Amino acid sequence: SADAPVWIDEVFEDRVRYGLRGQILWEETSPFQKITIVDTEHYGRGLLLDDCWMTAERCEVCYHEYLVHPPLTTAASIARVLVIGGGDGGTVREVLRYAEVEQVDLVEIDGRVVELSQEYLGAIGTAWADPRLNVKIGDGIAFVQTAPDASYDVILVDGSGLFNREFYENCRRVLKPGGVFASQAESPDSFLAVHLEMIETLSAVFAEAKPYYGWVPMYPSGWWSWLYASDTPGQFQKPQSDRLAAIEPQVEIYNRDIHQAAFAQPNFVRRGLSARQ
Amino acid sequence: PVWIDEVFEDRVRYGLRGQILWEETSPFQKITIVDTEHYGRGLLLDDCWMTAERCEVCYHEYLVHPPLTTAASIARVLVIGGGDGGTVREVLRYAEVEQVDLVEIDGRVVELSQEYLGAIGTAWADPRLNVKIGDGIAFVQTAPDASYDVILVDGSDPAGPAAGLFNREFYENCRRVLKPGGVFASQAESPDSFLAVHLEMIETLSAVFAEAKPYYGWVPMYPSGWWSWLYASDTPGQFQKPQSDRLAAIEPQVEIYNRDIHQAAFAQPNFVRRGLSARQ
Ligand SMILES: C[C@H](O)COCC(COC[C@@H](C)O)(COC[C@@H](C)O)COC[C@@H](C)O
Numbered sequence A: 001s002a003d004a005p006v007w008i009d010e011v012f013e014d015r016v017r018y019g020l021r022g023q024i025l026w027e028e029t030s031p032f033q034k035i036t037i038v039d040t041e042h043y044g045r046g047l048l049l050d051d052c053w054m055t056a057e058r059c060e061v062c063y064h065e066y067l068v069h070p071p072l073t074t075a076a077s078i079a080r081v082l083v084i085g086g087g088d089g090g091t092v093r094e095v096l097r098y099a100e101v102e103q104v105d106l107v108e109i110d111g112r113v114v115e116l117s118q119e120y121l122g123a124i125g126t127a128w129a130d131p132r133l134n135v136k137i138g139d140g141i142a143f144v145q146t147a148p149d150a151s152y153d154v155i156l157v158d159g160s161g162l163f164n165r166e167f168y169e170n171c172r173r174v175l176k177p178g179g180v181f182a183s184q185a186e187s188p189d190s191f192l193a194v195h196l197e198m199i200e201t202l203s204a205v206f207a208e209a210k211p212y213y214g215w216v217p218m219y220p221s222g223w224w225s226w227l228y229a230s231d232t233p234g235q236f237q238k239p240q241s242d243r244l245a246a247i248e249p250q251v252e253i254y255n256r257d258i259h260q261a262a263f264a265q266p267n268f269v270r271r272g273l274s275a276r277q
Numbered sequence B: 001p002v003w004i005d006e007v008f009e010d011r012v013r014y015g016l017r018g019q020i021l022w023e024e025t026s027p028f029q030k031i032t033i034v035d036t037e038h039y040g041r042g043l044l045l046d047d048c049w050m051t052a053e054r055c056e057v058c059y060h061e062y063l064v065h066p067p068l069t070t071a072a073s074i075a076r077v078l079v080i081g082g083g084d085g086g087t088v089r090e091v092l093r094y095a096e097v098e099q100v101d102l103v104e105i106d107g108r109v110v111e112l113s114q115e116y117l118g119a120i121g122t123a124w125a126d127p128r129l130n131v132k133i134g135d136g137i138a139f140v141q142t143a144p145d146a147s148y149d150v151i152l153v154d155g156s157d158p159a160g161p162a163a164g165l166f167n168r169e170f171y172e173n174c175r176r177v178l179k180p181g182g183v184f185a186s187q188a189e190s191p192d193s194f195l196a197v198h199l200e201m202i203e204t205l206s207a208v209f210a211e212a213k214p215y216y217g218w219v220p221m222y223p224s225g226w227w228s229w230l231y232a233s234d235t236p237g238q239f240q241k242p243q244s245d246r247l248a249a250i251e252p253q254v255e256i257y258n259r260d261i262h263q264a265a266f267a268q269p270n271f272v273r274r275g276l277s278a279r280q
């Protein structure tokens, strides 16, 4: 292998590249994808899938805190949480910081991502042994189609077409009253058209769907987004005081002001959405 | 076409496919004008991305609107740096601005930006704009008390011609030069890629001015793409009081910035809040 640290580049559309100098600790192809475990100088250990940046030890909280804490502070209850994806273990770690959470089911199609993340990325996945976590290797899409009505308080998609309308309708069916759906919603910079289409799809399925915005330096443009959906309008703005007071002292980024801030929409998003109303 | 990279401490790189249109070394710095497939025509200084036609509003709207919406008066504005023209374009959107002084050390930056980056610098012809090729640090040392409503520092990283722009004596002269109710703003690097500098800037400016508050936004061509600016003034909380008449004239003319974006950008991550406490 390489004597010294190499440039590990994610190339976007053959015309942008973002790279981190680091060592390859392990690379294999699973039946689903190429998995590359790396040791970066700037961010520590991390993960690519099909030569795209997924995570790293010191650029992960910015993804995981934004996916998890806005839904978990606002859902009427948080006893039962479903994560679709979650392979690196950072989403379930954030979800398990809340004492009210009773069960988290993680459903990840590629068992090699979980094994390799548990073996090398333990500094990100600190909650694998939490007796509330149940890890299932299988298709996340089939799981929500096959799950009971009103069985989960929160549904988090931690992965990325196969997330179509029928999938999101199952999500609404499987959510309990007062419950929250959330997922990544691509870049308003690098994937605007898909960004807007996802907002429109979730707005047609749920009573309210709101995008929110933050930073992932290793994703295309570094300008990333999420989508919150519930069947109560204005729920996204009303985190529970007691959940905020408990979570704020345990996280690196998220607080009551970041929570309100992230939902401010840039004029170009507001305009792209009103063009289609 | 070739990869044009900004390399960040031999650890991180950000590249755009494109072509080199012009390169020279001035008495101050290496100037690179490029065309890029992804963001059109841009500017590197000493191999650091400064600007591009389709990646520039995220920087220029953030530097300019929060101070211009909030200063008690905006008749006289001083811009230090800003050779590419985008900062003064944003400033000159306001009807109540009467004069904008742009003090740029490197005349070649203004000339190459006028020749090649006219699509960013759309306001060079504004009669209210006076371009002065000189050092910003010397300019505010010389300027009289209470002579400007707004000072914007549109400079680069702390290493080379932009270095003195991060020092306490410069910040003291800026607070001296500002009129009552006026506003200072600077780019303040990245809380991901330059956390120690970002927090030192917050601390030094917080000491000089009654209040200084970081604010956060996006610049995909800058290291991490997670960027920041510093608001400072002699009125605590002035950053939360943007004027409705200024917002209603500006919002229709800008791609990102609005009332909600203005208030959101000041939300501080826990690790910035705690990092300022570790500093004490
Ligand atoms: C919100 C922003 O426009 C406020 O202006 C600040 C300010 C108003 O004074 C405060 C008031 C009497 O309690 C004070 O700035 C004082 C600093 C600079 O020491 C300035 O307004 C003064 C103009 C109208 O000359």
Ligand SMILES: CSC[C@H]1O[C@@H](n2cnc3c(N)ncnc32)[C@H](O)[C@@H]1O
Pocket (backbone or CB within 6 Å): B043, B045, B050, B051, B080, B081, B082, B083, B084, B103, B104, B105, B106, B109, B134, B135, B136, B137, B154, B155, B156, B161, B162, B163, B164, B165
């Ligand atoms: C893309 S524009 C960034 C700008 O900051 C300018 N600059 C850096 N240091 C100073 C200084 N001390 N005085 C005036 N302009 C500066 C650079 O020459 C450039 O136009």
